[PDB]
Amino acid sequence: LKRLQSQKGVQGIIVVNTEGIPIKSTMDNPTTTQYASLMHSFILKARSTVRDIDPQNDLTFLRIRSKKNEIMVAPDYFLIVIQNPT
């Protein structure tokens, strides 16, 4: 989506399916590949960790902040948003 891509700070948006394959991206192919597979295994770990801590709970949102950027993830497929640090 254009509106979300256009927000201050946002660098790109990737939608990946349940197997981690990008089904939509606003980014170039190499960068989409830089992120999709690596983010997929990390997202599976976030989801399984929430459930190992409380079987009746569910992951709804993730924010990973680093020195250079920030990544948000929302389950729905997974929506991945890459952006400047907030």
Added chain:
Amino acid sequence: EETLKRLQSQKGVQGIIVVNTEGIPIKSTMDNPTTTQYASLMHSFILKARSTVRDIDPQNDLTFLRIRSKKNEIMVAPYFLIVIQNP
């Protein structure tokens, strides 16, 4: 520690855990079984967050994590400081 009390007392906060590099809880404001519910499972997840940031960009570093769920929210800052709170 005084800062732990101040942080524990914030609206929404349920507890605070400090784990070392091996994921051993070295400090906690929570009961022992809850501290154990979280410390081991969180340590594994935190190593994965840190290694993922670096696999994506070898020159980057994880600085903060927020994991939000239906029932609660967990924040982590690199020791690792773990804060469990209401959504």
